[PDB]
Write a protein that binds this ligand. Structure first.
Ligand SMILES: [Mg+2]
Ligand SMILES: [Mg+2]
Lengths: 144, 144, 144, 144, 144, 144, 144
RNA sequence: AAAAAAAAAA
RNA sequence: AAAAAAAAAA
RNA sequence: AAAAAAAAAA
RNA sequence: AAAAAAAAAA
RNA sequence: AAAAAAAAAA
RNA sequence: AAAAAAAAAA
RNA sequence: AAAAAAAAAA
RNA sequence: AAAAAAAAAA
RNA sequence: AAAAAAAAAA
RNA sequence: AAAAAAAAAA
RNA sequence: AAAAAAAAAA
RNA sequence: AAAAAAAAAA
RNA sequence: AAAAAAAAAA
RNA sequence: AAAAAAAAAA
């Protein structure tokens, strides 16, 4: 290969964009209480911690969740996800349960193309329920 | 295609990274005086304006430059680029000139693999000379 | 096969080198405190314990890390690695988490060719964060 | 073939560079004392005697060395090279010896792509040891 | 690829040359007056500005010229080149004209093998005529 | 190729070994008196000078020897090797002689698989005889 | 190839001609007034400036014309050609116009074989009309 | 893709 | 169409 | 690549 | 039939 | 196109 | 085996 | 790769 | 090009 | 025969 | 017919 | 990849 | 191996 | 099965 | 015969 700087025969000034889109998998945790659904805000996704504080919208493609602390004594971990949408909330309760008490429960869902519109900080993604006091989510999305 | 949300049969918690790398083409302008070289600082590349303020290092791959204002009366535009490196500056003066007085001059250079190390804000990329008072650069790079 | 000593018809004196290079995977442990990053010194790699005390430089190729003690009560193990470089530090935080509370978390990263320069004892390799009080690293490197 | 001047149908003004790079094999000699290593300075490569006084940086690719005067009485010539690098010196001692007392000893080494960064006059290339009072080097390098 | 220094099994001392030849495209400008031919001296090619001040001879292969300033009001740029040779000057007047008043005129000629002998500083390359006050030349040549 | 750090999806903790074996060609010299056999100790192979002071055992595979100083006036160099073994010494006297007085003599022998057991510092490898006052050995061996 | 003079085994005296024909493209300019056709004389083609002053006849094959100075304010350039012939003039008015105000207009016409007879200095080639005050012609022709 | 100069390689 | 970064997939 | 003009060649 | 110069062409 | 003499070459 | 110089040949 | 001398083998 | 040791990989 | 750099080319 | 040791060979 | 229920399609 | 985002390329 | 380092080989 | 959703399967 070349071991020195070489000239590029540049042409006309190109189309440019200083502030592009970004396809991402974002990991974060939420605290959950027993018997109570937690609504996960979209605003969690915009943070210097993810390099995404310059965005104000996001298109969510899929949501996966894992229990993140141990379950109560005698119990296996479970997590349930209910999709929320601005045009009308769902009533599905997708659920995963652990089969070893020492292991995480997990589940996810995919958002179909027809429901991939933008959401902003004040919108919610899903409701989470669990017997564990924290849940770890990884959300696949398109910042724009 | 699917018109409804569907379940994903998630497995174990994956490897994650909240703060990934990003391959980018960054456009910005510098002011240049007649007969005087301008050293372009790497710090120009870290800005909320580019969504890159969370990074502190960058690996530069190539540099292209265009004149960005009109040249002096009677003259065609020119731009020259001299590569700078922390391990030893170059003395190449890659140059482009316009062939129509109403058109931009342009030139660029590629940095070979052996010289693609990180640079930080206090480092310089290149020296620019021109007969035009501003130069527009587009720098291809890897933020990390 | 031959069962006795046999003659070799040696020729001219060959090129020799009493002190060659060595490609290695080196295992060692570091102690980590909660909430605090630990900077792993390159100096840890030069030791009679690894037969490497005669080297003064090393080129690191990849870094893998495991948690080495159990996590706090109710938690799963995690480990994070942030690459460090003399020419500019990274801000990636590569992370692994366990999915069974009794199991190690692990993660690693590879160093690309353009960043494989020598490091010496006073340099650092990476920052480690964990909720476990010890982390076991295995570093693939070329002593020279 | 053509025996007269002929027209060239020139187009637009091309990209140009008055001060290009140059790939070279540079021959020079150093004086060496018995039992003492000599550090070879990079500055030796920049000289009007090689047409290279306009350069301030160089990328070294390989180093070859020969003994250049006769050895001490009763001895065969030897030469040893230890590579030096700004990011961390090596401890290899690549060695050639003569097999006829009237013949030069020689040896060399190649620098891998990952270590081919620029050096400047104040940097050193390698350490040389020999039982002969002069060593002849040929250095393959890229002036830039 | 190799990431460390490796040995080269050098043989006999090679043929060497500290002061090699160099094939180059040299860009420079000359000032031209209206109605008057400017003889371009070969001495313009030997300069620290081109890294060629150590040469005293050169073999010219081809000459290209562009107008470098705007033409007089109402006119299109033109440039003419007449080849000069120590053994007998030519009377060809190779000519380019612009077809857009804002654009450079250009033309060139090639010297055939039978006329490619050395020239020294006091020799002349060609005569230039133009309606523009500066002409930019690019000369392809073999310094020796 | 990749120009940035990338994640490695590490699994379970691997099998490791901080203190591996090493296959080597070790060069060293012994001083020899006329008419007198010199017994070469295995202990010569364990030294910081070869990076092998952390080993206590070695399996020798082959032995090569060259005369290292000039022979007596009027003579050609010779070297003889007699293999020695803890289970029973040999009486072979493998011998090389020079055919030019200015040139080294050389010879070697290979140890068959059935005799490749470990040796320690107090063991001897071979006896050397020569008309030259130093002999250079290169021993191919497996440190363990 | 041969590097010395060699013999030619010449035969009988050949047919010869001291004054041959010559196929040429001749460039010259004419001044034109607004609203008035200029008749281009064939005599313009016979000149020491073209090396053609020894001819008294020419066979014209084709005529091309370009405007040679800028057009009036607000206008695009145009040029029209009307072919003239000793046996009877044409009334074709072949016309080109510029599509950029800064650019030359051009047009040309070809003379068919049946009309390619000789012309002399007193004959006319074509009529030119333009809104520009000079027109540049290039005439392809056979001097005889 | 082919050619010249410098460098390197089997 | 191939290469690299992030993403997702069989 | 083909054609005209001048040269040269087998 | 191939080369070189000047022209012209797809 | 082959042979001899001088040169050069892979 | 190919090329240049000189010779000779079909 | 093949031949001789000593040994072993299917 | 094949075999050993260490490293890495699908 | 392939790779780098400087030049030239279809 | 293949292998080890010693010698010789292309 | 095949099968059952609901929906749709050529 | 295929698809999407940013990058670079023939 | 492929690559790097050290070793050995035809 | 192919596509979506719920179930079952190798
Ligand atoms: Mg000799
Ligand atoms: Mg225009």
């Amino acid at each position: 290969n070349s071991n020195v700087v070489t000239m590029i025969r540049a042409g006309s000034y190109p189309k440019v964009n200083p502030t592009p889109t970004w396809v991402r998998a974002i990991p974060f945790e939420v605290s959950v209480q027993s018997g109570i659904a937690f609504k996960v805000p979209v605003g969690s996704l915009f943070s210097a911690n993810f390099r995404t504080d310059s965005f104000t919208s996001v298109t969510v493609m899929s949501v996966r969740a894992w229990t993140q602390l141990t379950p109560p004594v005698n119990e296996y971990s479970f997590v349930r996800l209910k999709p929320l949408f601005k045009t009308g909330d769902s009533t599905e309760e997708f659920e995963g349960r652990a089969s070893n008490i020492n292991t995480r429960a997990s589940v996810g869902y995919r958002i179909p193309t027809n429901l991939r519109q933008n959401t902003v900080a004040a919108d919610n993604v899903c409701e989470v329920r669990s017997n564990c006091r924290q849940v770890a989510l990884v959300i696949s999305c398109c910042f724009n």
